[PDB]
Amino acid sequence: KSLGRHLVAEFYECDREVLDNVQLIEQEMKQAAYESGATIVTSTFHRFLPYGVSGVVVISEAHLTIHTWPEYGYAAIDLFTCGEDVDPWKAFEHLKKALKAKRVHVVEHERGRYDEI
Amino acid sequence: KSLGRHLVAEFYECDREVLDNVQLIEQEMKQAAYESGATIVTSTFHRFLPYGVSGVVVISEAHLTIHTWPEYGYAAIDLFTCGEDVDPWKAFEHLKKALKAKRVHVVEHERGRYDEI
């Protein structure tokens, strides 16, 4: 149907200690990419004091990104995967559990629809 | 009304040679980040084989990403920016021009709505 599947997710009421832990966030993001069966290309995570954590796990022709706002218990997550063998929802599940999100809103986009290309 | 603005764009019928030029793509992506008013934290580009370029420019609490499919003249672009000072539509303009897309579809998402946070 499409080259890739992309989940644009809003995570609310997360564990704020976790959202402010850059080493833990990177760990859980890499674990999520593994759960989805994705192949990791590179991974870069950082936390600059005035903010929360930001990071990206670049995968084959796609990416998993996260930007956290500990002060609001909120996280902006994007799970973009390519290939019928890579499931964005597996990454979503692991992350939802790891961040202890109590409320989520997710929009799923078909990136590169075959009838559009 | 929200922490950030997010453009999910589909670029069709792009200059396939540009889509497969990893150095040029990197230049236009960082330049697009400049024109939008964002602050680049880091960036990482990789070329997919036999064809394709992947890249992510991490900015303050956000990101700009691109995944190209030269064999289809298609590129999946994401322009997520935070702050009233950064406008994702400027990056879009620069990229539309750089890739010479002849048809584009863009969805704008509000990431982290204040009324939800």
Side-chain angles (χ1 to χ4, degrees), chain A residues 2-83 85-96 98-117, chain B residues 1-84 86-96 98-117:
Chain A
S2 65
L3 293 175
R5 308 180 64 190
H6 183 188
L7 309 186
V8 177
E10 305 289 277
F11 278 24
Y12 306 110
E13 282 84 288
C14 298
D15 180 310
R16 304 179 182 200
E17 289 308 299
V18 179
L19 297 188
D20 198 38
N21 189 323
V22 68
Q23 327 84 63
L24 185 51
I25 291 292
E26 173 162 49
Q27 176 189 304
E28 306 290 27
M29 286 290 278
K30 290 182 179 180
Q31 184 58 51
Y34 178 67
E35 309 281 49
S36 68
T39 291
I40 299 183
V41 174
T42 57
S43 164
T44 174
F45 286 84
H46 51 266
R47 171 173 182 284
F48 297 123
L49 296 174
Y51 305 135
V53 178
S54 279
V56 55
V57 173
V58 184
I59 56 173
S60 296
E61 316 183 273
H63 68 272
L64 309 188
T65 62
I66 184 175
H67 299 287
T68 77
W69 277 263
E71 70 277 36
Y72 304 122
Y74 167 77
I77 291 165
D78 281 75
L79 307 171
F80 189 153
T81 65
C82 285
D85 291 292
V86 191
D87 180 15
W89 287 100
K90 295 296 172 53
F92 163 78
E93 195 54 56
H94 176 72
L95 292 172
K96 198 296 299 178
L99 276 54
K100 332 285 273 303
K102 310 314 184 309
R103 188 162 69 76
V104 305
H105 186 283
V106 185
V107 178
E108 177 166 348
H109 287 116
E110 295 171 53
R111 307 301 296 278
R113 279 168 292 290
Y114 291 149
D115 54 6
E116 291 306 327
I117 296 174
Chain B
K1 298 199 66 178
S2 68
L3 291 178
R5 288 179 286 183
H6 187 183
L7 305 189
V8 174
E10 300 285 89
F11 277 31
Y12 305 108
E13 300 170 58
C14 299
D15 178 315
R16 312 196 177 191
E17 298 194 302
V18 176
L19 292 189
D20 196 32
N21 185 327
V22 74
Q23 312 95 67
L24 181 54
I25 290 295
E26 181 171 1
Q27 292 187 50
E28 298 297 9
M29 277 298 280
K30 294 178 63 183
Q31 182 60 199
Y34 294 131
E35 297 188 8
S36 73
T39 304
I40 307 176
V41 172
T42 191
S43 73
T44 175
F45 290 75
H46 301 286
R47 59 166 52 269
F48 195 80
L49 2 74
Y51 295 124
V53 176
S54 178
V56 56
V57 178
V58 182
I59 55 173
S60 186
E61 294 175 324
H63 68 262
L64 306 194
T65 59
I66 189 173
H67 301 292
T68 70
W69 274 268
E71 62 274 60
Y72 301 123
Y74 167 81
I77 292 168
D78 283 71
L79 307 172
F80 183 149
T81 64
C82 284
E84 68 178 302
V86 185
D87 176 31
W89 287 96
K90 293 298 190 193
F92 162 81
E93 295 299 355
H94 185 61
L95 292 171
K96 182 286 163 188
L99 277 53
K100 310 174 186 180
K102 290 167 55 182
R103 172 179 50 184
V104 302
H105 188 284
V106 192
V107 171
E108 174 164 354
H109 286 123
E110 294 187 358
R111 301 304 295 278
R113 281 178 58 68
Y114 297 139
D115 68 351
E116 292 286 5
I117 294 311

